[PDB]
Each structure stands twice: as C-alpha cells, then as structure tokens.
Amino acid sequence: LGGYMLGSAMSRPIIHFGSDYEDRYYRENMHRYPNQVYYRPMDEYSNQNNFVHDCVNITIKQHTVTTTTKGENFTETDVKMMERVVEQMCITQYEKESQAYYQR
C-alpha cells in the first residue's frame, strides 16, 4: 500500500448464499469480518470490474495479512463470503464518489 485510499465503513451488506445455515454463518462472523474497503482514487484506472477485483483483493488480502499477525489463517469459504460483501462495498464507493466524478 503505497498510499491507496480507505473509503469508509459501509452499512454491512448481507449476502443470501442460499442456506439459512450460511445466513447465520455470515451474520455471526460479520463482526470479525471487514466493514470498510480499500481502493486507489479514480486517478489512473476507473474500470467497472477491474477497479472492483483489485480493491476486493487488496481489502481481503490486507485483512489476511492483518490477521496472520494474530496467528489467524482464513479459509476459501470465509474468503468467498468476504468477496461477495467487499465487492458490493467497493461498487457502492464506485457509485457515491464516481457519480460526483461523472458530473461534468
């Protein structure tokens, strides 16, 4: 992270993976999980999928390293749960700021 930008905390979106089990699964763990995401400003690349898939990785990958620092090691299902959320979150930032950026 040579700088990037922290957007803010979002409103904690929720993903209905398709099990009432997996509904509790996220709902309980959503406190330990991220609620903010990390992007560059729109100054270089501003690409509907690409700005997403890089921020989502940067957020969850940083979250990974920040938790290896407490001896914690996440798993694919936890990370796929995070991805759906962190994707919805960076898309929200790429509306609320980008809409003002596209007011010209």
Curated annotation (Swiss-Prot):
The glycosylation pattern (the amount of mono-, di- and non-glycosylated forms or glycoforms) seems to differ in normal and CJD prion. Changing N47S: In schizoaffective disorder. Glycans are attached at N57, N73. Changing Q93R: In GSD; with neurofibrillary tangles. Monomer and homodimer. Has a tendency to aggregate into amyloid fibrils containing a cross-beta spine, formed by a steric zipper of superposed beta-strands. Soluble oligomers may represent an intermediate stage on the path to fibril formation. Copper binding may promote oligomerization. Interacts with GRB2, APP, ERI3/PRNPIP and SYN1. Mislocalized cytosolically exposed PrP interacts with MGRN1; this interaction alters MGRN1 subcellular location and causes lysosomal enlargement. Interacts with KIAA1191. Interacts with ADGRG6. Belongs to the prion family. The normal, monomeric form, PRPN(C), has a mainly alpha-helical structure. Misfolding of this form produces a disease-associated, protease-resistant form, PRPN (Sc), accompanied by a large increase of the beta-sheet content and formation of amyloid fibrils. These fibrils consist of a cross-beta spine, formed by a steric zipper of superposed beta-strands. Disease mutations may favor intermolecular contacts via short beta strands, and may thereby trigger oligomerization. Its primary physiological function is unclear. May play a role in neuronal development and synaptic plasticity. May be required for neuronal myelin sheath maintenance. May promote myelin homeostasis through acting as an agonist for ADGRG6 receptor. May play a role in iron uptake and iron homeostasis. Soluble oligomers are toxic to cultured neuroblastoma cells and induce apoptosis (in vitro). Association with GPC1 (via its heparan sulfate chains) targets PRNP to lipid rafts. Also provides Cu(2+) or Zn(2+) for the ascorbate-mediated GPC1 deaminase degradation of its heparan sulfate side chains. This is Major prion protein. It comes from Homo sapiens. The lineage of its organism: Eukaryota, Metazoa, Chordata, Craniata, Vertebrata. The gene is PRNP. The chain holds residues 125 to 228 of 253 of the full protein.
